[PDB]
Design a protein around this ligand. Structure first.
Ligand SMILES: COc1ccc(Nc2nccc(-c3ccc4c(c3)CCCC(=O)N4)n2)cc1
Length: 250
């Protein structure tokens, strides 16, 4: 736990430009170690009321070490800005891949779902649940392995939007949503408005294009149950026949 400063880094290529600061390639001067630097504006964290949410996320994310979870090495701030020192994921976001390829084959999807489930299983056994398990938040390492990055309805389970009580089962719903989006190229409750999406999620109205195979339909259908208790354990996901037939990672 060495306290860092901007002068300890050479900043490079913008990796992502969003409304919330930006993420840059950076290199640590002394070590030459390449990483990614997320630049947040402190006045936009006060006035979005999330400074607590940041502090707690940073604390949790610094302790977590899994091959499919993007490492947070540390953080610092100056007058204006807060800096997150992150693992650099050379092959970029799953979002971008999905934009490129429009949709993923069964093998790539099943592999991604394995990697997710593994990283989630590990998460859960440290009492960490998640909300934004979505393509913008999944990155790809040098080996093309999935890495969960973490910090609009489309990925949220019924219990959450309805305002009901929720458990670790939210993340199972997310896998189903993502599994669907990976194969189809759009998430299963997508709409043109929030209000309608809300209805689609709440009534669990999804359908499958012809090309989605029977095994995939079965797994997605099992993951997208209204009743949390009826969604499978992560172990059952990893041991689904469609997953084991198609995945590449064990
Ligand atoms: C376009 O090619 C890339 C792009 C990113 C990378 N590596 C990388 N490594 C750590 C963080 C990030 C990161 C973090 C948050 C983020 C983004 C990116 C931008 C789009 C998604 C989004 O909404 N926000 N990217 C490598 C090649």
């Amino acid at each position: 736990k060495r306290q860092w400063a901007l002068e300890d880094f050479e900043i490079g290529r913008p990796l992502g430009k969003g409304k919330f600061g930006n993420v840059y390639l950076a290199r640590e001067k002394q070590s030459k170690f390449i990483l990614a630097l997320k630049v947040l504006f402190k006045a936009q964290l006060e006035k979005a009321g999330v400074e607590h949410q940041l502090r707690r996320e940073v604390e949790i994310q610094s302790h977590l070490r899994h091959p499919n979870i993007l490492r947070l090495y540390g953080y610092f701030h100056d007058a204006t800005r807060v800096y997150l020192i992150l693992e650099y994921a050379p092959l970029g976001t799953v979002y971008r891949e999905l934009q490129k390829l429009s949709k993923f084959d069964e093998q790539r999807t099943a592999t991604y779902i394995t990697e997710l489930a593994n990283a989630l299983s590990y998460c859960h056994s440290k009492r960490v649940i998640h909300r934004d398990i979505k393509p913008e938040n999944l990155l790809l390492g040098s080996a093309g392995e999935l890495k969960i990055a973490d910090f609009t309805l489309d990925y949220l389970p019924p219990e959450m939007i309805e305002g009901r009580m929720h458990d670790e089962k939210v993340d199972l719903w997310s896998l189903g949503v993502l599994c669907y989006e990976f194969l189809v190229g759009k998430p299963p409750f997508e709409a043109n408005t929030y209000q309608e999406t809300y209805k689609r999620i709440s009534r669990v109205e999804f359908t499958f294009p012809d090309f989605v195979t029977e095994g995939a339909r079965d797994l997605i259908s099992r993951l997208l149950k209204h009743n949390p208790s009826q969604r499978p354990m992560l172990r059952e996901v990893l041991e689904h026949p469609w997953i084991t037939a198609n995945s590449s990672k064990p």
